[PDB]
């Protein structure tokens, strides 16, 4: 057994004239799992460059008025650029 | 027996004329694991480079008015550039 | 013993004219574990470089008015650049 | 006149052999 | 004449042999 | 008249031989 007579995730507002009354629940079990095993290989963002490269006069901008991140976690495995706002060259 | 007559994540508001009454529950069990085992290999963001590179006059701006992070943790394994706002070159 | 009739995470507001009544629980078990075992290997941000590299006149800027981090811990393993606002080159 | 000789080869040999499950017994 | 020789070979051998599970018994 | 020789080879050999589980018995 696990849960019986339980009160788990509730808003109860018998009153009047209230505003923005809120209740949040998030559960994360076993997310963002990598398993690489026996004789496997992962090759990630590691190119082989023998050619010559001349990137010039590049401009990159990320701008925002505001970022609100409410109850929004970031879980990352073998990832890189996990974000709310991104501006990217190459 | 995990829970029984139990009251967990609850707002109760019989009062009146109130504002911004909030209740939050986050649980994080075993997230963002990386297991690597036996003969396995991960090669990550490590190029082999033999050609010449000549990046010039590159400009990169990340800007904001504000960042409000609430109830939003960051959990990262073999990750790299995990963020709210991001600007990236090369 | 641990729980029967338990009360875990609650706002009770029977009074009137209140504002900003808040209640938070975050819990974190066994997150961001990395395990490397037997004959395995991880190569991470450690390139092999024999080309010539001549970066010139590079500008990088990270700017904000304010950063609020409430109930937002950072849990990093074999990560690197975990942050709120991020400007990166190379 | 001018002479420039660039010699920069790359060689990336990998061998990964008996990393499986071999001859193991279960009961 | 004027001379430059630039000699920078790169060689990245790896060998991994019996790094698995071999002949183990479970009972 | 000028001569420049720049000799910078790179060798990164690795060998890993018996780092698995071998010949163990569980009872």
The DSSP annotation for C15-80 comes to SSS-EEEEEEEEEEES-S-EEE-TT-EEEES--EE-S-B--BS-EEEEE-SEEEEES--EEEES--
- Determine the Cα–Cα distance for residues A37 and D16; give it in Å rounded to an integer: 13
Token readout for A88 is: 């990217």
Question: Among residues C81, A48, C30, which one has the least CA distance to residue B74?
Answer: C81
For residue A19, count CB atoms less than 10 angstroms from its CB and return exposed for 0-12, middle for 13-18, buried for 19 or more.
exposed
What gap in Å lies between CA C19 and CA B13, rounded to an integer?
Answer: 12
Which two tokens mark B75? 């959990």
Solved by what technique?
A: cryo-EM
Is the CB of residue C51 less than 8 Å from the CB of residue F10? no
CA distances from D11 to A13, B38, E12, F17 (A): 71, 25, 6, 22
**To what resolution in angstroms was this structure determined?**
2.6
Return the exposure string of C46-72: e unless at least 16 CB atoms fall within 10 Å of the residue's CB, then b.
eebbbbbeeeeebebebebeeeebebb
Q: Does D10 touch chain B (CB under 8 A)?
A: yes
CA-wise closest residue to C73 among C32, C23, C44, C34? C32
Instruction: Give the Cα separation of B7 and C15 in Å (integer).
Output: 21
User: Which chain C residue has the Cα nearest residue A59?
Assistant: C59
Of the partner residues F8, F12, F19, the one whose CB lies closest to the CB of residue C39: F19
Contact present, B29 and C32 (Cβ < 8 Å): no
Strand partners, E1: none
| Tokens 């990169």, located at residue | B60
Contact criterion met (CB < 8 Å) for C12 and B12: yes
- Residue C78, C-beta contacts closer than 8 angstroms, at least 6 positions apart: B34, B77, B78, C34, C42, C44
3-state helix, strand, coil in chain B (%, to 5): 0, 55, 45
**How far lies B30's CA from each of A29, A75, B48, in Å?**
6, 11, 34
Those of residues 70-89 in A touching chain D at CB distance below 8 A are none
Gap between the Cα atoms of C59 and C81, Å rounded:
19
> Which pairs from C56-60 meet CB under 8 Å and 24+ separation?
C56/B54, C56/B55, C56/B56, C56/B57, C57/B56, C57/B57, C57/B58, C58/B55, C58/B56, C58/B57, C58/B58, C58/B59, C58/C89, C59/B58, C59/B59, C59/B60, C60/B60, C60/C87, C60/C88, C60/C89
Asked whether the beta carbons of B55 and A52 are under 8 A apart, the reply is no
Question: What is the per-residue DSSP string for A6-33?
Answer: -EEEEEE--SSS-EEEEEEEEEEES-S-
Q: Tokens in use for B62?
A: 């990340």
The structure tokens listed for A22 are 């809120």
* Total Cβ atoms within 10 A of residue D19: 26
Cα–Cα distance measured from residue C31 to residue C20, given in angstroms and rounded to the nearest whole number: 31
Are the Cβ atoms of A49 and B44 closer than 8 angstroms? no
Residue written as tokens 């938070």? Answer: C24
Is the CB of E23 less than 8 angstroms away from the CB of D26? no
**All residues at 6 or more sequence positions from C1 whose CB lies less than 8 Å from its CB, including other chains:** none
- CB contact under 8 Å between E10 and B48, yes or no, is yes
Q: Which of E10, E19, E21 sits opposite B50 (nearest CB)?
A: E10
Chain C contact set for F12 (CB, 8 A): 48
Q: Is B50 on the interface with D (CB under 8 A)?
A: yes
- Residue pair F5/E7 in contact by the 8 Å Cβ criterion: yes
Q: Which of E10, E15, E23 sits opposite D10 (nearest CB)?
A: E10
Can you say how many angstroms the Cα of residue C29 is from the centroid of all Cα atoms in its chain?
15
Q: Which residues pair with C44 in a beta bridge?
A: B44
Contact A50 B53 (CB under 8 A): no
DSSP count for chain D of H helices, then E strands: 0, 5
Question: Are A45 and A80 in contact, with CB atoms under 8 Å apart?
Answer: yes
Determine how β-strand A85-89 pairs with β-strand B85-89: parallel
């Amino acid at each position: 057994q696990s849960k019986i007579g339980s009160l788990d995730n509730i808003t109860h507002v018998p009153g009047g004239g209230n505003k923005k009354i809120e209740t949040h629940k998030l559960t994360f079990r076993e997310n963002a799992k990598a398993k690489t095993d026996h004789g496997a290989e992962i090759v990630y963002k590691s190119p082989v460059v023998s050619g010559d490269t001349s990137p010039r006069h590049l401009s990159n901008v990320s701008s925002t008025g505001s970022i609100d991140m409410v109850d929004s976690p970031q879980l990352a495995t073998l990832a890189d650029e996990v974000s709310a706002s991104l501006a990217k060259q190459g």
